[PDB]
Design an enzyme around this catalytic site. Sequence first.
Site, PDB file in Angstrom:
ATOM      1  N   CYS C  46      25.010  34.977  43.770  1.00 37.75           N
ATOM      2  CA  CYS C  46      24.427  33.793  44.390  1.00 37.75           C
ATOM      3  C   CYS C  46      25.043  33.473  45.750  1.00 37.75           C
ATOM      4  O   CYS C  46      24.345  33.033  46.665  1.00 37.75           O
ATOM      5  CB  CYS C  46      24.560  32.585  43.460  1.00 37.75           C
ATOM      6  SG  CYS C  46      26.149  31.729  43.569  1.00 37.75           S
ATOM      7  N   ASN C 234      37.225  44.106  41.689  1.00 35.73           N
ATOM      8  CA  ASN C 234      36.977  43.360  40.458  1.00 35.73           C
ATOM      9  C   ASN C 234      35.498  43.044  40.253  1.00 35.73           C
ATOM     10  O   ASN C 234      35.157  42.156  39.467  1.00 35.73           O
ATOM     11  CB  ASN C 234      37.806  42.068  40.421  1.00 35.73           C
ATOM     12  CG  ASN C 234      38.050  41.565  39.011  1.00 35.73           C
ATOM     13  OD1 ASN C 234      37.997  42.328  38.049  1.00 35.73           O
ATOM     14  ND2 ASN C 234      38.325  40.272  38.884  1.00 35.73           N
ATOM     15  N   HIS C 324      33.383  52.212  42.661  1.00 33.45           N
ATOM     16  CA  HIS C 324      31.975  52.483  42.388  1.00 33.45           C
ATOM     17  C   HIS C 324      31.802  53.792  41.628  1.00 33.45           C
ATOM     18  O   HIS C 324      30.970  53.885  40.718  1.00 33.45           O
ATOM     19  CB  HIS C 324      31.182  52.515  43.694  1.00 33.45           C
ATOM     20  CG  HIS C 324      29.701  52.622  43.500  1.00 33.45           C
ATOM     21  ND1 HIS C 324      28.848  51.553  43.672  1.00 33.45           N
ATOM     22  CD2 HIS C 324      28.922  53.672  43.146  1.00 33.45           C
ATOM     23  CE1 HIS C 324      27.607  51.939  43.434  1.00 33.45           C
ATOM     24  NE2 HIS C 324      27.624  53.220  43.112  1.00 33.45           N
ATOM     25  N   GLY C1047       8.947  13.842  40.702  1.00 28.75           N
ATOM     26  CA  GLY C1047       7.588  13.813  41.200  1.00 28.75           C
ATOM     27  C   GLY C1047       7.545  13.461  42.672  1.00 28.75           C
ATOM     28  O   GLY C1047       8.567  13.406  43.362  1.00 28.75           O
ATOM     29  N   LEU C1224       4.520  14.690  48.396  1.00 23.97           N
ATOM     30  CA  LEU C1224       3.969  16.042  48.420  1.00 23.97           C
ATOM     31  C   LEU C1224       4.954  17.123  47.980  1.00 23.97           C
ATOM     32  O   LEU C1224       4.751  18.295  48.321  1.00 23.97           O
ATOM     33  CB  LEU C1224       3.457  16.376  49.837  1.00 23.97           C
ATOM     34  CG  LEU C1224       4.464  16.566  50.981  1.00 23.97           C
ATOM     35  CD1 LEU C1224       3.769  17.184  52.180  1.00 23.97           C
ATOM     36  CD2 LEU C1224       5.153  15.269  51.392  1.00 23.97           C
ATOM     37  N   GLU C1226       5.479  18.474  45.096  1.00 25.68           N
ATOM     38  CA  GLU C1226       4.963  19.369  44.068  1.00 25.68           C
ATOM     39  C   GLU C1226       3.717  20.127  44.505  1.00 25.68           C
ATOM     40  O   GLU C1226       3.208  20.948  43.736  1.00 25.68           O
ATOM     41  CB  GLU C1226       4.652  18.578  42.794  1.00 25.68           C
ATOM     42  CG  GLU C1226       5.839  17.836  42.206  1.00 25.68           C
ATOM     43  CD  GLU C1226       5.444  16.932  41.055  1.00 25.68           C
ATOM     44  OE1 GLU C1226       4.506  16.125  41.226  1.00 25.68           O
ATOM     45  OE2 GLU C1226       6.068  17.030  39.976  1.00 25.68           O
TER      46      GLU C1226
HETATM   47  C1  LIG Z   1      26.547  40.668  42.259  1.00 28.72           C
HETATM   48  C2  LIG Z   1      26.832  42.152  42.020  1.00 28.72           C
HETATM   49  C3  LIG Z   1      25.757  42.898  42.496  1.00 28.72           C
HETATM   50  C4  LIG Z   1      25.777  44.293  42.392  1.00 28.72           C
HETATM   51  N1  LIG Z   1      24.627  45.093  42.901  1.00 28.72           N
HETATM   52  C5  LIG Z   1      24.645  46.543  42.794  1.00 28.72           C
HETATM   53  C6  LIG Z   1      23.476  47.353  43.312  1.00 28.72           C
HETATM   54  O1  LIG Z   1      22.546  46.809  43.805  1.00 28.72           O
HETATM   55  N2  LIG Z   1      23.500  48.806  43.198  1.00 28.72           N
HETATM   56  C7  LIG Z   1      24.677  49.481  42.578  1.00 28.72           C
HETATM   57  O2  LIG Z   1      24.704  50.659  42.486  1.00 28.72           O
HETATM   58  N3  LIG Z   1      25.812  48.670  42.078  1.00 28.72           N
HETATM   59  C8  LIG Z   1      25.787  47.210  42.190  1.00 28.72           C
HETATM   60  N4  LIG Z   1      26.907  46.428  41.697  1.00 28.72           N
HETATM   61  C9  LIG Z   1      28.057  47.100  41.080  1.00 28.72           C
HETATM   62  C10 LIG Z   1      29.130  47.443  42.128  1.00 28.72           C
HETATM   63  O3  LIG Z   1      28.620  48.334  43.062  1.00 28.72           O
HETATM   64  C11 LIG Z   1      30.320  48.077  41.405  1.00 28.72           C
HETATM   65  O4  LIG Z   1      30.808  47.185  40.453  1.00 28.72           O
HETATM   66  C12 LIG Z   1      31.416  48.383  42.426  1.00 28.72           C
HETATM   67  O5  LIG Z   1      30.975  49.372  43.301  1.00 28.72           O
HETATM   68  C13 LIG Z   1      32.696  48.852  41.721  1.00 28.72           C
HETATM   69  O6  LIG Z   1      33.777  48.781  42.631  1.00 28.72           O
HETATM   70  P1  LIG Z   1      35.067  47.801  42.258  1.00 28.72           P
HETATM   71  O7  LIG Z   1      36.003  47.715  43.441  1.00 28.72           O
HETATM   72  O8  LIG Z   1      34.569  46.419  41.906  1.00 28.72           O
HETATM   73  O9  LIG Z   1      35.876  48.449  40.964  1.00 28.72           O
HETATM   74  P2  LIG Z   1      36.722  47.549  39.861  1.00 28.72           P
HETATM   75  O10 LIG Z   1      35.861  46.413  39.346  1.00 28.72           O
HETATM   76  O11 LIG Z   1      37.958  46.987  40.523  1.00 28.72           O
HETATM   77  O12 LIG Z   1      37.171  48.532  38.599  1.00 28.72           O
HETATM   78  C14 LIG Z   1      36.161  49.220  37.890  1.00 28.72           C
HETATM   79  C15 LIG Z   1      36.751  50.525  37.276  1.00 28.72           C
HETATM   80  O13 LIG Z   1      36.998  51.398  38.219  1.00 28.72           O
HETATM   81  C16 LIG Z   1      38.538  51.870  38.056  1.00 28.72           C
HETATM   82  N5  LIG Z   1      39.084  52.194  39.352  1.00 28.72           N
HETATM   83  C17 LIG Z   1      38.968  51.457  40.460  1.00 28.72           C
HETATM   84  N6  LIG Z   1      39.603  52.096  41.452  1.00 28.72           N
HETATM   85  C18 LIG Z   1      40.108  53.235  40.954  1.00 28.72           C
HETATM   86  C19 LIG Z   1      40.841  54.251  41.531  1.00 28.72           C
HETATM   87  N7  LIG Z   1      41.400  54.614  42.818  1.00 28.72           N
HETATM   88  N8  LIG Z   1      41.227  55.288  40.803  1.00 28.72           N
HETATM   89  C20 LIG Z   1      40.902  55.352  39.490  1.00 28.72           C
HETATM   90  N9  LIG Z   1      40.182  54.355  38.918  1.00 28.72           N
HETATM   91  C21 LIG Z   1      39.789  53.298  39.657  1.00 28.72           C
HETATM   92  C22 LIG Z   1      39.158  50.854  37.529  1.00 28.72           C
HETATM   93  O14 LIG Z   1      40.338  51.311  36.735  1.00 28.72           O
HETATM   94  C23 LIG Z   1      38.104  50.224  36.599  1.00 28.72           C
HETATM   95  O15 LIG Z   1      38.150  50.809  35.375  1.00 28.72           O
HETATM   96  C24 LIG Z   1      26.883  44.937  41.806  1.00 28.72           C
HETATM   97  C25 LIG Z   1      27.959  44.185  41.330  1.00 28.72           C
HETATM   98  C26 LIG Z   1      27.936  42.793  41.435  1.00 28.72           C
HETATM   99  C27 LIG Z   1      29.094  41.933  40.926  1.00 28.72           C
HETATM  100  S1  FES Z   2      28.149  33.980  43.566  1.00 31.03           S
HETATM  101 FE1  FES Z   2      27.473  32.633  41.915  1.00 31.03          FE
HETATM  102  S2  FES Z   2      29.513  31.725  41.821  1.00 31.03           S
HETATM  103 FE2  FES Z   2      30.256  33.415  43.080  1.00 31.03          FE
END
Ligand SMILES: Cc1cc2nc3c(=O)[nH]c(=O)nc-3n(C[C@H](O)[C@H](O)[C@H](O)COP(=O)(O)OP(=O)(O)OC[C@H]3O[C@@H](n4cnc5c(N)ncnc54)[C@H](O)[C@@H]3O)c2cc1C
Ligand code: FES
EC number: 1.2.3.1
Lengths: 50, 50, 1292, 99
Positions: C46, C234, C324, C1047, C1224, C1226
């Site tokens: 959000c 995170n 990721h 309303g 207006l 609604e």
């Molecule tokens: C609002 C929101 C919208 C999103 N939209 C999309 C989207 O549109 N398309 C898409 O593909 N994804 C989407 N995501 C997911 C997001 O891309 C992944 O959660 C993000 O890329 C993970 O990276 P992170 O830093 O948060 O990893 P973390 O949350 O910090 O950890 C996840 C895991 O990865 C491990 N890890 C992290 N770093 C390392 C490292 N160097 N070595 C070994 N292990 C590691 C950790 O131990 C953990 O287990 C979305 C997430 C949110 C919250």
């Molecule tokens: S984006 Fe909904 S509270 Fe952080």
Amino acid sequence: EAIYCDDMPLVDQELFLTFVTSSRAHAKIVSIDLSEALSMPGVVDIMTAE
Amino acid sequence: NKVMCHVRRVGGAFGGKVLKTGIIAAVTAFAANKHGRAVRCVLERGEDML
Amino acid sequence: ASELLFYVNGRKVIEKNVDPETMLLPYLRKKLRLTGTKYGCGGGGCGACTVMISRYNPITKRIRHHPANACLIPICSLYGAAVTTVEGIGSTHTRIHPVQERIAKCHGTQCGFCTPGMVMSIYTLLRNHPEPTLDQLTDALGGNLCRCTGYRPIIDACKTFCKTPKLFAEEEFLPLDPTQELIFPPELMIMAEKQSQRTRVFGSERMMWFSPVTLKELLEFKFKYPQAPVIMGNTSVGPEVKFKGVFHPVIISPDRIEELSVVNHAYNGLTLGAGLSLAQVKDILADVVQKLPEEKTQMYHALLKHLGTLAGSQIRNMASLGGHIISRHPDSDLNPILAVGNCTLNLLSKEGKRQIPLNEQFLSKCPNADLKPQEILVSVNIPYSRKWEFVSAFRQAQRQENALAIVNSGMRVFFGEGDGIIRELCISYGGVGPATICAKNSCQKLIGRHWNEQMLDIACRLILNEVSLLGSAPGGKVEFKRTLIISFLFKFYLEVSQILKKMDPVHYPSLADKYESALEDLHSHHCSTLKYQNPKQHPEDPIGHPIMHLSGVKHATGEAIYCDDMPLVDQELFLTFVTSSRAHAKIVSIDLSEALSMPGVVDIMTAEHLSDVNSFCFFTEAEKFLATDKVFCVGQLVCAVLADSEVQAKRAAKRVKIVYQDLEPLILTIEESIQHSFKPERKLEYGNVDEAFKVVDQILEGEIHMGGQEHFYMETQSMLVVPKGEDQEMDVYVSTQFPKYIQDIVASTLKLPANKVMCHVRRVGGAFGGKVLKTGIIAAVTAFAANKHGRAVRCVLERGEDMLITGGRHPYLGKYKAGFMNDGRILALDMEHYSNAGASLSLFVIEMGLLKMDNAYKFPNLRCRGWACRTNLPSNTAFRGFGFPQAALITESCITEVAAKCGLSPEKVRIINMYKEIDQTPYKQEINAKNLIQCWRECMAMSSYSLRKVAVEKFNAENYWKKKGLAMVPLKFPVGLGSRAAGQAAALVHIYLDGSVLVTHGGIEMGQGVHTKMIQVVSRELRMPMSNVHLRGTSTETVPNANISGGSVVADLNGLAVKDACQTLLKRLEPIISKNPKGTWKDWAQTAFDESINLSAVGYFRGYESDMNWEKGEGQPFEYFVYGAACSEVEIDCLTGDHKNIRTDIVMDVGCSINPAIDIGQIEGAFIQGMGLYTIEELNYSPQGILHTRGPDQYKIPAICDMPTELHIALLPPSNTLYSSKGLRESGVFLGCSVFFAIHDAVSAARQERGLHGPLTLNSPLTPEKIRMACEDKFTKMIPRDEPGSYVPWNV
Amino acid sequence: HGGIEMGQGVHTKMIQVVSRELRMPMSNVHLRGTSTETVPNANISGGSVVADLNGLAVKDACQTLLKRLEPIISKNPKGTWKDWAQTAFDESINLSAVG
Ligand SMILES: Cc1cc2nc3c(=O)[nH]c(=O)nc-3n(C[C@H](O)[C@H](O)[C@H](O)COP(=O)(O)OP(=O)(O)OC[C@H]3O[C@@H](n4cnc5c(N)ncnc54)[C@H](O)[C@@H]3O)c2cc1C
Ligand code: FES
Ligand code: FES
């Protein structure tokens, strides 16, 4: 159970205010030293006439 | 219209809670607005009679 | 043993022995008392909690600013960083930052809850690009949602920073002074220069936290606790902590490690560190693609494509590249691209290095191709592409960006040495299974063939067999997902065959001329023009001027105190609920043993703990608060956990064990409810319809289903209940629309007279009808717990809790039988309305539906019936429009269906059936539709309709896989309540001896600027500037017996009451004003006190007359009518299902607008809110009645990418109402159906070109799932269907 | 009202005035305190006439309300004060008054 003014619950982060009063009946203020008092624990501010 | 005053009950007054009380409330609200916090001011008996 | 040190708004923040589970958003609000940062959804989607994190890299000697969602940042990861919030960049007592001044003065604030998130995103981008382009600002706002403004005025304020009659004076804004921005805290700059190598340890009784700052130490901690995750942004484990019940006792969160954030330009490719953020990755990739030849930047272009639609700017700046990859989300937008181009992972252990390839077995988490639990991921290598090597990526979600993909893909092909034979092939798909999968068998059986249509057809039937989705596949949309797999293969075959044609033109053929549009992507650009009126009026009379919302700058600086923004009162307790997990079952046992003994728990209340006060009657039949022996829907209140803190409350709530026994029947759909006693019928008839069905040419039967809607107010259900301690006095501070109702249900629950229970509401962050009945139920049990334990209790629901307990809009079902002649005129029309009312009953929605179903069409012979249906779903509430967006859609759907049977365009069928200037409604009420016909004609000329209708037909005949559509609908929105007593309003006005005025009234500020309009009324009726008038809020202690503030007439009715009190005061003062017309308002009020004149007065307006005899069917229930018309244009993608709102033209008859700035904002917000109801907002329910809320099932509201690229709004020029005005708020919700029929028209153009005549029954909402499956082609009939009774689906 | 309860029982006397002028027991009437947000420009609450003067003002507001309700009370003299105030709301009668 009758809530008086100071009986009101302490609101969040509220501060307390005390006064220092005159010790002479008719005199001239020649100096006011707030140095030691400002550094004491918990002190937030000390206000004079200026 | 920005400053409101609320009084539920007073534990006795007899005319002694007007001019000097407003003076204390004046500097108490000034300190409250300056530091953006709530300020409470309660005098002790010796302070009060003086 | 370690301490936590960081900065917030320049002030140092030290914390000794921190709880590592502490998040930044609750720390800013509950510990630092900085309530500007708001809570929106708790998932990071959000942007209401947008803040700026600032770090100093001592090696580069430069400061890096980046935005972030505070609700996902643990404070232990902020050591040495500088947090900046809304209060930090400026306030009212110091200096207003230009970002705050412009977003507020451009009228970009209504409820104002999302404003702090908007301000910080704009401020952070301006700190990285002081001279930006509009493209950069819209991309920063991509992660910020708003339910009120429609994003238009925020874009206008953003244009002010670009070196590219109105509602605001742009020339008066402060120029963005880059010299006096916030300086970085110098103490942190000295801290970073001393590279301390000691790791920091944070611990509590639940979790330990290790922050190694050197690569050597990090490898040691990953070996000690191999199971401990490595927290980076995170954004993957954070959301799982909240809603998915995961818990990690050990946590490793490395600081900035130079080996983990490496970017090198090698000879074979590039290797990027696993510690880089996805936003940083796209920056180094966007740099290299304009520096290197296009033959080698093939892989990077595919990554940059999906990184642009990858969530929002805040999540991209937090999520890491390595995070990721390791997360391995099934709907990953980047894993399928990396899996098809031979990417390697540089793993480092304490024993030594290791390099494994990123392939199929790795994404499936096979232990042989996975990481050993002792080694980390340091970097990933992405090689350059070769000549005759081409890769492309595709995706499709609910909207264009910030939405999880339903099906995405990445595909790479290689020919080599310049001949049309494939030597390497690798394709991958995500969102089709638990992990990203590659069709390794399909790519094997195809090596050696040529690029052609004869191979593609065998590639489909081979792929469809390999990647198979059971009919019961999670995420639903199985038939849609089967087609997207094929369509992406068709688009890929089209793309690379065009690259071969460009490189080797002689050997390869040119593509089909009608196929080129399929390669264009629907990419936006935002233009807006607003027209309104602006002589013989006093310049100090503020009526009719675009006056800014009073709390506007307060919305922009975070100083606007909302309900949960109130400071924590002494010893207050938090209350959370446990809700039903079954749709229809019997409660056989409730175990509160383990939960009662948990830390902080004070009390847990069930149905028996309330005894006789477990039921309140809403003047139809009594509804129970807490569930007794049976549950009737998911999300029904069962227990109420009361604990010392919010955290300890939910923890005990998750330990309450409840056992169920499912009951029968499980009613879910409307028809399932029609199968099963007696239901109160309602009907209105006009003329005789049975006689007309024999004199008309054709008879057409049809029906249309319409899905529900969520309010999705940005401020969730929030309330604080504070007992006074005397005479059982109770003050409730609630976010609600009906303070009188809150007063009643709380007083009834506590068995107290009304005079002991007062209700106080200052402002509400959006409501839309969803803060009344269910809010009073929560306040009833919250005040009961507060009185029982003699403490103040606060209850704030999370987003997931809110959508599950609160209802929403009523899902409709409209059956109709229409008698009409070939000229387009409809004579006979029989109608049936059905509303999915939910668990309990709702008649008013059906009533207002039948009375407003006629819209702008005179049906000479009409019979309209309606009913409400009990289901095992949460009971729905009245929304904006009060049933009009549903009753007017089924008629427009009917008119569109007879237009197909008549061969004429729907716009000609609408104008033929329209009311005349003077005409009669079905309820025998006369109307003056002079402004109705004028809205239709000006909208045609303002939009240049006929010039654009022929152009769209030109596009549909030239393009086969892309179609355009155009539609225009009229609007007649009747305004009125049930009786005169319901439109009754009151006010109270004081005049102090200094001349200032304090006014209060029964209206609730929810963003409609009711308070702003009232001060405008005081300013005119008393001839004083608004600066002299002030208003604090709404309270039952000042204005009793106030009606509901929902309303269009809330401001109108209360405006007449405030006008009555000002006139009462002005008449008492006429002797004093006449005897001294030169004196100010101060000496007027002083001499009034000297002459014993009362300076306080009560305003009162009895309400408009209104009557309706529902037996006969005639009556006069509407004071006035709001007329208008809307024209929308859409281009759809036939393959994917995607669509783009091109242009929308709105004209409205508001009469004399009391505030044109506020009234235009309500038009835009209503249209966008209605646009989402008909297009993207979809509620996914399971066959067991469980609402889905994770993955591609996430509810999505319109974002910036969904707003039409060109928007034109004109107010028709102009007396029974206040100042000849018209409510207006609604009306525009139904005007959002113009885009629905624009997509309907475009789908018809694709079905006509391919010859698919028949019943085009498109239901609402028109999601990309329904759009693509209507455009039948070879891929549509090719998918393997499933028989209806074999599988139990994931949805419907 | 603008009076301050300092022990002289001004609040108690006002509820006695409401009880007579509206013909209802004191248990039905309640008072929370004194606030400039409700009664503006109040005089000092000191001396012998604090209850007397505020007693006349409370008596004025009760009479103002009682006159607006005379059609409803005469047409139903047996009904309680609850259905009197409910039908007053139904008939669009203002139930708030300034003394
Ligand atoms: C609002 C929101 C919208 C999103 N939209 C999309 C989207 O549109 N398309 C898409 O593909 N994804 C989407 N995501 C997911 C997001 O891309 C992944 O959660 C993000 O890329 C993970 O990276 P992170 O830093 O948060 O990893 P973390 O949350 O910090 O950890 C996840 C895991 O990865 C491990 N890890 C992290 N770093 C390392 C490292 N160097 N070595 C070994 N292990 C590691 C950790 O131990 C953990 O287990 C979305 C997430 C949110 C919250
Ligand atoms: S984006 Fe909904 S509270 Fe952080
Ligand atoms: S969310 Fe922007 S004003 Fe309601």
